[PDB]
Each structure stands twice: as structure tokens, then as C-alpha cells.
Amino acid sequence: LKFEIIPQELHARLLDNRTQAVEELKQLLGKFNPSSTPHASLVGFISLLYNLLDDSNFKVVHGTLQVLHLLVIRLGEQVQQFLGPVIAASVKVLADNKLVIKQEYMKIFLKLMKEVGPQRVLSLLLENLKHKHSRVREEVVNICICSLLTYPSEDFDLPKLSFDLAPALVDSKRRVRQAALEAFAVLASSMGSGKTNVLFKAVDTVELGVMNAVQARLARKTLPRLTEQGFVEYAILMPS
């Protein structure tokens, strides 16, 4: 058993129709206890999954993401030990503009937030606002929105959050900016109106136009919402 989990024949089929192999792997994961598995082996396994997400075939990527989700599930608290790797793995597939993919990585990120708390997840994740793929940036912002709609205000450091998100307000790409304005509407709602002042300071750190769009958005007292699938639906397309 490779990594104490995978039969060498399945491993060989995974590394050399990868999709069937991947689903076989999922089956094996079904009844598996990583609390009985040495750390080094779990590191190996996760490394393998990370490589499988490099596949050109999105169905392999999808199946691997399902395996990763299940692993995260089985792990429980132990996920805390692998927060970094699992988040790098999940950020990789954010460039992939496919709904089946997004289903799986949204499942993963929500599980992560459930296990180690939303703020941790989001700070790690928000470092990827400097990522060169604009869909990565866009989805970072949407996962933040999802987080702020799933968890109460006090689970978050909202000033920190708005300062970390303010650069998306001036992103070169329209979709990232639209995402960031929705996020700012949710921040305004979560701070309560007696503290929007900090949001305007956040806007000051990236512009000193954006002010006008932010105010226009905030004046619209409507918020995005979450689908059952955990996707964000936007409240409004600002003419901007």
C-alpha cells in the first residue's frame, strides 16, 4: 500500500483513463482512517493529489477534487495540520472556469472554514490577490463573500479584511472590481452603519472614482446571497 492507502497497481494507473483510477481511489477513501496513518504518508498522498490537479483533462481534476474533499472530511481536526497544502491545491483549480470544479472547491473551502475558522482561511487565501490569473483573484473575493455570508460578524477582523480586499476595488479586471464592490456591501452590512468609516479609509489606501462606485454600491441596500451549492449570487450590476 502506497502512502498506506493506495495499492501499487492503482498508484501506477494514477501516475501513468486516469478518471476511473481516481474514482477507485475515492472508493478506497470511503472507509479509511487518516488518524491511523502516519503524517509522512498523508503528506505523500496530498502531494499526489496536488499533482493530479495538474491534469489537462478537467474530469481528472474534478475527480481528484472529490478525493481531496473526501480526505478533508475524513481528516477532521487533522486538517489543521494540512491547511497550507490543501489551500494551495484548492487555489490551483480556481483558474478553471467550470461549474463542476467550482462545486468541489467551494465544498472544500467551506469545510476548511468550518474546521479552523473563517478568518484564518481567508487570510491565507487573500495572499492570492497577487496571483497573475484574474479568475483566481475573482474567486478569492467571491470565497470571501461566501465566508462573510456564512459566519457571524464577530468571527472576522473586519477592518483587516476590508484593507486586504480594497486592492481588488482597483483591479485591472472588471469582474474582480465587481466582486470587490459586492464584498464591500457585505462588509458594510456586517460592520453596521455606525462603522462604514473604516471602509472609506480602506478605499483611501488604494485611490485618494472608486469612492464614487463604493458609495453608489453601498447606497443600494441589497446584498448578494448564497445558493445551496455555496455559490455567490450578486445583488446588482452597478453601471460602473
Side-chain angles (χ1 to χ4, degrees), residues 1-30 32-240:
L1 288 196
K2 189 73 180 190
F3 311 128
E4 312 240 13
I5 315 161
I6 320 170
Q8 295 293 99
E9 58 96 9
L10 184 48
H11 191 208
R13 279 155 54 204
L14 291 160
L15 277 188
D16 301 348
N17 191 342
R18 279 172 130 205
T19 304
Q20 152 82 4
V22 175
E23 163 97 350
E24 228 163 290
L25 184 47
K26 199 178 82 166
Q27 302 300 269
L28 294 183
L29 243 55
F32 159 77
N33 294 319
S35 86
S36 295
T37 310
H39 176 85
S41 282
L42 289 176
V43 174
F45 189 59
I46 286 161
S47 186
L48 178 64
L49 298 185
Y50 184 74
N51 294 133
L52 291 176
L53 297 175
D54 286 316
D55 212 280
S56 293
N57 173 32
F58 81 95
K59 300 168 171 159
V60 172
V61 175
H62 174 259
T64 304
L65 284 174
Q66 286 187 305
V67 165
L68 182 57
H69 179 216
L70 177 53
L71 171 64
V72 164
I73 295 323
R74 305 295 290 166
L75 283 177
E77 81 182 74
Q78 261 196 93
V79 86
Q80 187 150 302
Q81 178 58 63
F82 302 97
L83 194 58
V86 172
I87 281 185
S90 301
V91 170
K92 181 186 294 181
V93 298
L94 297 185
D96 184 1
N97 195 38
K98 294 180 174 61
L99 183 146
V100 282
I101 294 316
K102 178 170 167 194
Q103 275 173 356
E104 298 303 326
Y105 67 64
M106 286 314 306
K107 286 166 180 161
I108 292 154
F109 280 113
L110 285 163
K111 195 60 179 203
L112 290 184
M113 291 173 184
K114 186 210 312 308
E115 289 299 312
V116 318
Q119 186 57 79
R120 261 198 89 187
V121 172
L122 290 195
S123 302
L124 299 186
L125 188 54
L126 273 166
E127 280 171 57
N128 293 272
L129 277 190
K130 68 174 87 50
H131 197 285
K132 73 170 179 186
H133 203 303
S134 59
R135 189 182 134 81
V136 167
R137 304 201 300 280
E138 196 195 333
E139 285 302 274
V140 166
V141 185
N142 283 327
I143 289 165
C144 290
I145 297 167
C146 177
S147 203
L148 288 151
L149 291 170
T150 302
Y151 292 99
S153 284
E154 70 268 15
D155 287 4
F156 298 97
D157 187 337
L158 298 172
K160 184 172 73 179
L161 204 46
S162 60
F163 275 63
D164 284 344
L165 278 175
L169 289 175
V170 289
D171 197 278
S172 66
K173 304 301 298 163
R174 180 160 59 70
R175 280 157 184 173
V176 181
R177 297 193 305 266
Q178 287 178 146
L181 293 161
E182 292 294 289
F184 261 62
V186 183
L187 291 171
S189 163
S190 299
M191 291 163 173
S193 179
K195 291 178 176 179
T196 303
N197 289 337
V198 60
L199 284 182
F200 300 145
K201 303 202 238 130
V203 174
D204 278 336
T205 74
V206 303
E207 179 132 279
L208 293 191
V210 165
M211 198 45 176
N212 284 155
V214 162
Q215 292 186 294
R217 181 57 184 90
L218 265 36
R220 300 309 203 106
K221 301 311 296 251
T222 175
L223 294 164
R225 63 177 300 276
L226 292 184
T227 75
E228 183 178 2
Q229 293 159 113
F231 303 169
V232 176
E233 296 177 335
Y234 289 17
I236 184 164
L237 78 171
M238 286 317 282
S240 295

mmCIF file of all heavy atoms in Angstrom, residues 3-5 29 31-43 45 70-79 81-82, unseen atoms left out:
data_model
loop_
_atom_site.group_PDB
_atom_site.id
_atom_site.type_symbol
_atom_site.label_atom_id
_atom_site.label_comp_id
_atom_site.label_asym_id
_atom_site.label_seq_id
_atom_site.Cartn_x
_atom_site.Cartn_y
_atom_site.Cartn_z
ATOM 1 N N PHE A 3 1.572 5.083 0.438
ATOM 2 C CA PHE A 3 1.058 6.030 1.432
ATOM 3 C C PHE A 3 0.145 5.362 2.462
ATOM 4 O O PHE A 3 -0.651 6.046 3.114
ATOM 5 C CB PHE A 3 0.290 7.168 0.748
ATOM 6 C CG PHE A 3 1.030 7.795 -0.396
ATOM 7 C CD1 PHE A 3 0.421 7.937 -1.638
ATOM 8 C CD2 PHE A 3 2.333 8.233 -0.239
ATOM 9 C CE1 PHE A 3 1.105 8.510 -2.702
ATOM 10 C CE2 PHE A 3 3.019 8.809 -1.289
ATOM 11 C CZ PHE A 3 2.404 8.948 -2.528
ATOM 12 N N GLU A 4 0.257 4.036 2.593
ATOM 13 C CA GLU A 4 -0.623 3.228 3.455
ATOM 14 C C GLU A 4 -2.076 3.200 2.968
ATOM 15 O O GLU A 4 -2.965 2.759 3.694
ATOM 16 C CB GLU A 4 -0.596 3.740 4.903
ATOM 17 C CG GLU A 4 0.783 3.984 5.477
ATOM 18 C CD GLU A 4 1.052 3.145 6.712
ATOM 19 O OE1 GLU A 4 0.276 2.202 6.978
ATOM 20 O OE2 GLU A 4 2.036 3.439 7.421
ATOM 21 N N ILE A 5 -2.316 3.664 1.746
ATOM 22 C CA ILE A 5 -3.679 3.790 1.238
ATOM 23 C C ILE A 5 -3.858 3.130 -0.128
ATOM 24 O O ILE A 5 -4.781 2.344 -0.330
ATOM 25 C CB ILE A 5 -4.101 5.279 1.128
ATOM 26 C CG1 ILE A 5 -3.690 6.051 2.384
ATOM 27 C CG2 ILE A 5 -5.599 5.391 0.906
ATOM 28 C CD1 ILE A 5 -3.629 7.553 2.196
ATOM 29 N N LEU A 29 -11.021 5.663 -0.247
ATOM 30 C CA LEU A 29 -11.081 6.667 0.782
ATOM 31 C C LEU A 29 -12.312 6.542 1.623
ATOM 32 O O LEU A 29 -12.332 6.901 2.768
ATOM 33 C CB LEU A 29 -11.002 8.060 0.205
ATOM 34 C CG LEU A 29 -9.781 8.807 0.671
ATOM 35 C CD1 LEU A 29 -8.598 7.952 0.319
ATOM 36 C CD2 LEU A 29 -9.686 10.124 -0.047
ATOM 37 N N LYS A 31 -13.776 4.198 3.260
ATOM 38 C CA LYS A 31 -13.519 3.580 4.559
ATOM 39 C C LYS A 31 -12.019 3.602 4.892
ATOM 40 O O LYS A 31 -11.325 2.587 4.778
ATOM 41 C CB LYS A 31 -14.058 2.154 4.584
ATOM 42 N N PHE A 32 -11.532 4.771 5.305
ATOM 43 C CA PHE A 32 -10.116 4.977 5.580
ATOM 44 C C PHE A 32 -9.951 5.929 6.763
ATOM 45 O O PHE A 32 -10.689 6.912 6.880
ATOM 46 C CB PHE A 32 -9.409 5.515 4.328
ATOM 47 C CG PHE A 32 -8.113 6.228 4.611
ATOM 48 C CD1 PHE A 32 -6.965 5.514 4.899
ATOM 49 C CD2 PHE A 32 -8.046 7.617 4.573
ATOM 50 C CE1 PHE A 32 -5.783 6.168 5.161
ATOM 51 C CE2 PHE A 32 -6.868 8.276 4.832
ATOM 52 C CZ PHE A 32 -5.733 7.556 5.122
ATOM 53 N N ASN A 33 -9.004 5.638 7.651
ATOM 54 C CA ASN A 33 -8.843 6.438 8.870
ATOM 55 C C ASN A 33 -7.474 7.072 8.990
ATOM 56 O O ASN A 33 -6.558 6.464 9.546
ATOM 57 C CB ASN A 33 -9.108 5.585 10.110
ATOM 58 C CG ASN A 33 -10.549 5.137 10.206
ATOM 59 O OD1 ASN A 33 -11.467 5.911 9.935
ATOM 60 N ND2 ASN A 33 -10.756 3.879 10.587
ATOM 61 N N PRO A 34 -7.333 8.310 8.488
ATOM 62 C CA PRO A 34 -6.045 9.011 8.459
ATOM 63 C C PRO A 34 -5.449 9.254 9.855
ATOM 64 O O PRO A 34 -4.265 9.593 9.952
ATOM 65 C CB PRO A 34 -6.384 10.336 7.772
ATOM 66 C CG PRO A 34 -7.844 10.520 7.991
ATOM 67 C CD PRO A 34 -8.422 9.140 7.947
ATOM 68 N N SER A 35 -6.246 9.077 10.908
ATOM 69 C CA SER A 35 -5.733 9.165 12.271
ATOM 70 C C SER A 35 -4.901 7.926 12.618
ATOM 71 O O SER A 35 -4.216 7.897 13.645
ATOM 72 C CB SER A 35 -6.877 9.345 13.279
ATOM 73 O OG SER A 35 -7.412 8.095 13.675
ATOM 74 N N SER A 36 -4.966 6.912 11.757
ATOM 75 C CA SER A 36 -4.144 5.712 11.853
ATOM 76 C C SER A 36 -2.988 5.764 10.905
ATOM 77 O O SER A 36 -2.176 4.879 10.875
ATOM 78 C CB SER A 36 -4.944 4.476 11.481
ATOM 79 O OG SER A 36 -5.961 4.270 12.398
ATOM 80 N N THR A 37 -2.957 6.808 10.111
ATOM 81 C CA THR A 37 -1.952 6.991 9.078
ATOM 82 C C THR A 37 -0.877 7.944 9.555
ATOM 83 O O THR A 37 -1.178 9.037 10.030
ATOM 84 C CB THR A 37 -2.573 7.546 7.786
ATOM 85 O OG1 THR A 37 -3.716 6.761 7.431
ATOM 86 C CG2 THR A 37 -1.568 7.526 6.649
ATOM 87 N N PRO A 38 0.383 7.532 9.439
ATOM 88 C CA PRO A 38 1.495 8.430 9.754
ATOM 89 C C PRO A 38 1.490 9.706 8.907
ATOM 90 O O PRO A 38 1.170 9.683 7.717
ATOM 91 C CB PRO A 38 2.740 7.580 9.453
ATOM 92 C CG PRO A 38 2.251 6.375 8.714
ATOM 93 C CD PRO A 38 0.833 6.164 9.139
ATOM 94 N N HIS A 39 1.867 10.805 9.554
ATOM 95 C CA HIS A 39 1.943 12.122 8.942
ATOM 96 C C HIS A 39 2.654 12.143 7.587
ATOM 97 O O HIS A 39 2.154 12.738 6.623
ATOM 98 C CB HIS A 39 2.643 13.082 9.902
ATOM 99 C CG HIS A 39 2.858 14.449 9.334
ATOM 100 N ND1 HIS A 39 1.900 15.437 9.387
ATOM 101 C CD2 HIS A 39 3.920 14.987 8.688
ATOM 102 C CE1 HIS A 39 2.362 16.526 8.799
ATOM 103 N NE2 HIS A 39 3.587 16.281 8.369
ATOM 104 N N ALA A 40 3.814 11.494 7.518
ATOM 105 C CA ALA A 40 4.630 11.468 6.302
ATOM 106 C C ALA A 40 3.867 10.891 5.107
ATOM 107 O O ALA A 40 3.939 11.416 3.982
ATOM 108 C CB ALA A 40 5.904 10.670 6.549
ATOM 109 N N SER A 41 3.134 9.813 5.364
ATOM 110 C CA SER A 41 2.315 9.191 4.337
ATOM 111 C C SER A 41 1.194 10.126 3.872
ATOM 112 O O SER A 41 0.990 10.273 2.675
ATOM 113 C CB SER A 41 1.738 7.864 4.837
ATOM 114 O OG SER A 41 2.713 6.836 4.785
ATOM 115 N N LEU A 42 0.487 10.762 4.805
ATOM 116 C CA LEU A 42 -0.548 11.738 4.445
ATOM 117 C C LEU A 42 0.006 12.882 3.581
ATOM 118 O O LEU A 42 -0.661 13.349 2.631
ATOM 119 C CB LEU A 42 -1.210 12.305 5.698
ATOM 120 C CG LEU A 42 -2.120 11.340 6.455
ATOM 121 C CD1 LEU A 42 -2.644 11.966 7.741
ATOM 122 C CD2 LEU A 42 -3.265 10.893 5.559
ATOM 123 N N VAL A 43 1.224 13.322 3.912
ATOM 124 C CA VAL A 43 1.935 14.323 3.117
ATOM 125 C C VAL A 43 2.174 13.811 1.694
ATOM 126 O O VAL A 43 1.952 14.534 0.698
ATOM 127 C CB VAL A 43 3.297 14.708 3.766
ATOM 128 C CG1 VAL A 43 4.100 15.632 2.853
ATOM 129 C CG2 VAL A 43 3.082 15.372 5.110
ATOM 130 N N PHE A 45 0.426 11.452 0.077
ATOM 131 C CA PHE A 45 -0.887 11.342 -0.557
ATOM 132 C C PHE A 45 -1.379 12.687 -1.079
ATOM 133 O O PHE A 45 -1.791 12.817 -2.235
ATOM 134 C CB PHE A 45 -1.889 10.769 0.451
ATOM 135 C CG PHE A 45 -3.228 10.409 -0.145
ATOM 136 C CD1 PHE A 45 -3.323 9.480 -1.167
ATOM 137 C CD2 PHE A 45 -4.388 10.969 0.344
ATOM 138 C CE1 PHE A 45 -4.551 9.142 -1.709
ATOM 139 C CE2 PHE A 45 -5.613 10.628 -0.191
ATOM 140 C CZ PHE A 45 -5.692 9.715 -1.220
ATOM 141 N N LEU A 70 -13.169 14.482 0.108
ATOM 142 C CA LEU A 70 -13.446 13.351 0.985
ATOM 143 C C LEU A 70 -12.338 13.216 2.036
ATOM 144 O O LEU A 70 -12.606 13.006 3.218
ATOM 145 C CB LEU A 70 -13.589 12.063 0.177
ATOM 146 C CG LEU A 70 -13.817 10.790 0.990
ATOM 147 C CD1 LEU A 70 -14.992 10.968 1.935
ATOM 148 C CD2 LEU A 70 -14.093 9.633 0.036
ATOM 149 N N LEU A 71 -11.094 13.372 1.603
ATOM 150 C CA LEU A 71 -9.954 13.297 2.511
ATOM 151 C C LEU A 71 -10.101 14.330 3.619
ATOM 152 O O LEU A 71 -9.966 14.007 4.793
ATOM 153 C CB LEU A 71 -8.634 13.505 1.761
ATOM 154 C CG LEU A 71 -7.374 13.657 2.634
ATOM 155 C CD1 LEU A 71 -7.058 12.387 3.435
ATOM 156 C CD2 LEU A 71 -6.168 14.093 1.812
ATOM 157 N N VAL A 72 -10.388 15.567 3.225
ATOM 158 C CA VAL A 72 -10.622 16.643 4.175
ATOM 159 C C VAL A 72 -11.703 16.231 5.164
ATOM 160 O O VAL A 72 -11.561 16.431 6.369
ATOM 161 C CB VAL A 72 -11.052 17.940 3.465
ATOM 162 C CG1 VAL A 72 -11.658 18.915 4.464
ATOM 163 C CG2 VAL A 72 -9.867 18.569 2.748
ATOM 164 N N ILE A 73 -12.785 15.678 4.664
ATOM 165 C CA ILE A 73 -13.829 15.170 5.512
ATOM 166 C C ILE A 73 -13.315 14.153 6.535
ATOM 167 O O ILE A 73 -13.561 14.295 7.694
ATOM 168 C CB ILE A 73 -14.978 14.531 4.724
ATOM 169 C CG1 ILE A 73 -15.712 15.535 3.861
ATOM 170 C CG2 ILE A 73 -15.948 13.880 5.670
ATOM 171 C CD1 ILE A 73 -15.849 16.877 4.489
ATOM 172 N N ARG A 74 -12.618 13.134 6.077
ATOM 173 C CA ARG A 74 -12.121 12.092 6.938
ATOM 174 C C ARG A 74 -11.129 12.635 7.969
ATOM 175 O O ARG A 74 -11.068 12.176 9.081
ATOM 176 C CB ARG A 74 -11.479 10.976 6.131
ATOM 177 C CG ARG A 74 -12.334 10.340 5.057
ATOM 178 C CD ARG A 74 -13.537 9.611 5.592
ATOM 179 N NE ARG A 74 -13.182 8.402 6.294
ATOM 180 C CZ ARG A 74 -13.999 7.725 7.083
ATOM 181 N NH1 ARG A 74 -15.240 8.116 7.263
ATOM 182 N NH2 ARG A 74 -13.575 6.645 7.682
ATOM 183 N N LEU A 75 -10.376 13.634 7.578
ATOM 184 C CA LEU A 75 -9.369 14.208 8.428
ATOM 185 C C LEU A 75 -9.886 14.870 9.674
ATOM 186 O O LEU A 75 -9.329 14.696 10.712
ATOM 187 C CB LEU A 75 -8.501 15.187 7.664
ATOM 188 C CG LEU A 75 -7.433 14.615 6.750
ATOM 189 C CD1 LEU A 75 -6.700 15.699 6.009
ATOM 190 C CD2 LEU A 75 -6.479 13.772 7.528
ATOM 191 N N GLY A 76 -10.940 15.642 9.570
ATOM 192 C CA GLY A 76 -11.415 16.383 10.707
ATOM 193 C C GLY A 76 -10.436 17.425 11.178
ATOM 194 O O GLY A 76 -10.073 18.284 10.389
ATOM 195 N N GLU A 77 -10.062 17.367 12.451
ATOM 196 C CA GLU A 77 -9.156 18.342 13.038
ATOM 197 C C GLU A 77 -7.787 18.231 12.391
ATOM 198 O O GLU A 77 -7.102 19.233 12.184
ATOM 199 C CB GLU A 77 -9.044 18.133 14.549
ATOM 200 C CG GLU A 77 -8.088 17.021 14.951
ATOM 201 C CD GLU A 77 -8.039 16.810 16.451
ATOM 202 O OE1 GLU A 77 -9.007 16.249 17.007
ATOM 203 O OE2 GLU A 77 -7.033 17.206 17.077
ATOM 204 N N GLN A 78 -7.450 17.053 11.960
ATOM 205 C CA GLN A 78 -6.160 16.802 11.428
ATOM 206 C C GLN A 78 -5.952 17.715 10.221
ATOM 207 O O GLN A 78 -4.863 17.867 9.756
ATOM 208 C CB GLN A 78 -6.073 15.356 10.987
ATOM 209 C CG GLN A 78 -5.398 14.423 11.957
ATOM 210 C CD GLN A 78 -5.007 13.113 11.330
ATOM 211 O OE1 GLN A 78 -3.910 12.959 10.862
ATOM 212 N NE2 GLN A 78 -5.904 12.174 11.343
ATOM 213 N N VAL A 79 -7.019 18.290 9.698
ATOM 214 C CA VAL A 79 -6.868 19.138 8.552
ATOM 215 C C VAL A 79 -6.061 20.332 8.916
ATOM 216 O O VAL A 79 -5.407 20.899 8.094
ATOM 217 C CB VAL A 79 -8.160 19.470 7.795
ATOM 218 C CG1 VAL A 79 -8.874 20.655 8.381
ATOM 219 C CG2 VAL A 79 -7.858 19.710 6.340
ATOM 220 N N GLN A 81 -3.455 20.451 10.426
ATOM 221 C CA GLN A 81 -2.102 20.132 10.093
ATOM 222 C C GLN A 81 -1.876 20.327 8.627
ATOM 223 O O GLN A 81 -0.768 20.554 8.214
ATOM 224 C CB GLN A 81 -1.786 18.685 10.464
ATOM 225 C CG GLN A 81 -0.387 18.256 10.105
ATOM 226 C CD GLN A 81 0.668 19.134 10.768
ATOM 227 O OE1 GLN A 81 0.763 19.166 11.949
ATOM 228 N NE2 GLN A 81 1.438 19.853 9.984
ATOM 229 N N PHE A 82 -2.907 20.220 7.803
ATOM 230 C CA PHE A 82 -2.556 20.357 6.383
ATOM 231 C C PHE A 82 -3.183 21.555 5.668
ATOM 232 O O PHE A 82 -3.420 21.517 4.450
ATOM 233 C CB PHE A 82 -2.944 19.082 5.636
ATOM 234 C CG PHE A 82 -2.304 17.856 6.186
ATOM 235 C CD1 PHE A 82 -2.983 17.039 7.069
ATOM 236 C CD2 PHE A 82 -1.012 17.521 5.826
ATOM 237 C CE1 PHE A 82 -2.387 15.917 7.588
ATOM 238 C CE2 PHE A 82 -0.416 16.398 6.335
ATOM 239 C CZ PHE A 82 -1.103 15.591 7.216
#
